Design a protein around this ligand. Structure first.
Ligand SMILES: CC(C)(COP(=O)(O)OP(=O)(O)OC[C@H]1O[C@@H](n2cnc3c(N)ncnc32)[C@H](O)[C@@H]1OP(=O)(O)O)[C@@H](O)C(=O)NCCC(=O)NCCS
Ligand SMILES: C[N+](C)(C)C[C@H](O)CC(=O)O
Length: 599
């Protein structure tokens, strides 16, 4: 981003060794047996003794911070995404459901799409001009690098690890987006010769041509290849681009500013599961029989516009976190609401280039293999969307409690009520106050959270006593949060020590092969908060076979929740988890209301 800004920002720190190990042991107590804790406790003491293993690894990290702009950046990008071989669909790329639009006919659908494209191009203006406003997370300026990674970029399949291409700052920045309709991709320029952006009306006229140039779904859904295992896609990709035409088409897709998906009508479903289906549409496409083939999941930004009014998006995670994405959404959405003005006549426009794909028996086979893979993925996904209308940040705030901590504590209560024990819990923490900062881990399962969940369901504990435990759990969570955004958490630090050991060519410390670390890094609950002015909601699949993926947008009067699970694990159920979460939130409000503070 703006160089002047990025330079004034502090570099990612390396927390003290003893400090992090201290927090580690604390966060483990509620999720591991006493026997395992005692053992882990021993490993830690040795690991940090003077002239020991840990001390040496720690020095390595500090040297790393001196030789790099961010000691964690590259390591995190590779281990979290580039080296993650599972399909990006569901397992990595978050999906987003935006507010349903009122268009009723195809003309309105395209009308909205054109407005959306224009809105994005407007946001891009600030990016190219480095005029994008400065953000804060608590009186501290935040890194804006992520904003210069989302547009005109794409992920690229690699035989061993993937890579990412960014053409935003290339010699001749791309001036075209890509539009997908009935599995067919089209290259569309959204800028004039002079360099001015096309207007909503102009873009509309073009979208009309595009739609009529692909009225039927008779072409192979080549885009579905992008939803397969990364290793498999890497080989299919390499073969796919052997053809000049194919290579040319893929190239346009990768360089395009962003992709717009014009989804077709899908089989009407029961109103009680409608939202869950739309969520599926945005996350994976619904299947090879619906809209999954009308996408290119390597593309950083994909905006989806259904024909029934539904709209949303799915983005490739290597590029950024939710905040930057929603900032873009809030701007675009608010832009689509801007009234009209001088609808002067516009001169003829060129015909959008159709990105053809020469299919061969080998490619066809890859496509079919991709369809089968995706079917298995989809069928195994259990999604439940929950709109918590009872209240939002309003209640927790009136109680002088952090809404996010209130929600996280509520989730811990719900989980305990179901399984009778706590579990490793992950919550995304933004480290953007640091140059190139991405995230760290806030662990919601703690000593105080466990003390609360137990006392809460205890029919022998005074209701007033449960209130104290509640506030203490929330405060303990707020504290952890404050430390996390300040680079004082320990998860990324511990990962760094492990990676430092590998690089130092020294044996893997037992502390990392310890059963406790395995449990600690096996997140049965993987979560994140993605606040937005737009009444939208995000979602993603669980990070472990027996876990849940929960995301939420805390609004003032309500909270948009998404809960995912895998059907392969009989012990988990999205609907049930959502129900217990709704009830945990209500029960906590009831407890606090029953015992007011003032007088
Ligand atoms: C962890 C994190 C979500 C906490 O954010 P937060 O804004 O501090 O959340 P809180 O619930 O504490 O605060 C929300 C609101 O309640 C208020 N509040 C907090 N504590 C309060 C209290 N004790 N009493 C009254 N109000 C309080 C805040 O001022 C804020 O006010 P607002 O509604 O006017 O903005 C944030 O630090 C973060 O890391 N966000 C990014 C997460 C991310 O990366 N997500 C995407 C991952 S892909
Ligand atoms: C979805 N989840 C929590 C697994 C990953 C976050 O989106 C990103 C992060 O916390 O690094």
């Amino acid at each position: 981003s703006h160089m002047a800004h990025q330079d004034a920002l502090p570099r990612l720190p390396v927390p003290p060794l003893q400090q992090s190990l201290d927090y580690y042991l604390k966060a483990l107590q509620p999720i591991v047996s006493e026997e395992e804790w005692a053992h882990t406790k021993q490993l830690v003491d040795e690991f940090q003794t003077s002239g020991g293993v840990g001390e040496r690894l720690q020095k390595g990290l500090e040297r790393r911070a001196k030789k790099m702009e961010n000691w964690l950046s590259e390591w995190w990008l590779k281990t979290a995404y580039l080296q993650f071989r599972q399909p990006v669909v569901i397992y990595s790329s978050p999906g987003v459901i935006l507010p349903k639009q009122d268009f009723v006919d195809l003309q309105g659908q395209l009308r909205f799409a054109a407005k959306l494209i224009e809105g994005v191009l407007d946001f891009k203006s600030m990016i190219d001009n480095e005029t994008l406003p400065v953000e804060f997370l608590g009186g501290q300026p935040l890194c804006m690098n992520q904003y210069y990674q989302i547009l005109s970029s794409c992920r690229v399949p690699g035989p061993k690890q993937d890579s990412v291409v960014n053409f935003l700052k290339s010699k001749r920045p791309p001036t075209h987006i890509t539009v997908v309709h009935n599995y067919q991709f089209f290259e569309l320029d959204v800028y004039h010769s002079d360099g001015t952006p096309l207007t909503s009306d102009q873009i509309f006229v073009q979208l009309e041509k595009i739609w009529n140039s692909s009225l039927q779904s008779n072409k192979e859904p080549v885009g579905i290849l992008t939803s397969n295992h990364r290793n498999t896609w890497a080989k299919a990709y390499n073969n796919l681009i052997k053809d000049k035409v194919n290579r040319e088409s893929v190239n346009s897709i990768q360089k395009s500013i962003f992709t717009v998906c014009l989804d077709k009508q899908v089989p009407r479903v029961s109103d009680d599961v409608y939202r869950n289906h739309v969520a599926g549409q945005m996350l994976h496409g619904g299947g090879s029989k619906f809209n999954s083939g009308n996408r290119w999941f390597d593309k950083t930004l994909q905006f989806i516009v259904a024909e029934d009014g539904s709209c949303g998006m799915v983005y490739e995670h290597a590029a950024a976190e939710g905040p930057p994405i929603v900032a873009l959404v809030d701007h675009v959405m608010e832009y689509t609401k801007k009234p009209e003005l001088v609808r002067s006549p516009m001169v003829p426009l060129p015909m959008p280039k159709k990105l053809r794909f020469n299919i061969t028996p080998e490619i066809k086979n890859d496509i079919e293999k991709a369809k089968q893979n995706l079917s298995i993925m989809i069928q195994d996904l259990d999604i439940m969307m929950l709109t918590f209308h009872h209240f939002g940040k309003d209640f927790p705030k009136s109680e002088k409690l952090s809404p996010d901590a209130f929600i996280q504590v509520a989730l811990q209560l719900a989980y305990y009520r179901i399984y009778g024990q706590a579990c490793a819990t992950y919550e995304s923490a933004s480290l953007r106050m640091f140059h190139l900062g991405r995230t760290d881990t806030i662990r919601s399962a703690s000593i105080d959270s466990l003390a609360f969940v137990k006392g809460m369901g205890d029919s022998t504990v005074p209701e007033q006593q449960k209130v104290e435990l509640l506030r203490k759990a929330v405060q303990a969570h707020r504290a952890y949060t404050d430390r996390a955004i300040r680079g004082e958490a320990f998860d990324r630090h511990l990962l760094g020590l492990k990676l430092q050991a590998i690089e130092d060519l020294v044996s893997m410390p037992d502390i990392f092969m310890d059963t406790s670390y395995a449990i600690a890094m096996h997140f049965n609950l993987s979560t994140s908060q993605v606040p937005a002015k737009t009444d939208c909601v995000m979602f993603f699949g669980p990070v472990v076979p027996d876990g849940y993926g929960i995301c939420y947008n805390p609004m003032e009067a309500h909270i948009n929740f998404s809960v995912s699970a895998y059907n392969s694990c009989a012990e988990t159920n999205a609907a049930r988890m959502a129900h217990y979460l709704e009830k945990a939130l209500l029960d906590m409000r009831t407890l606090l209301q029953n015992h007011p503070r003032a007088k």
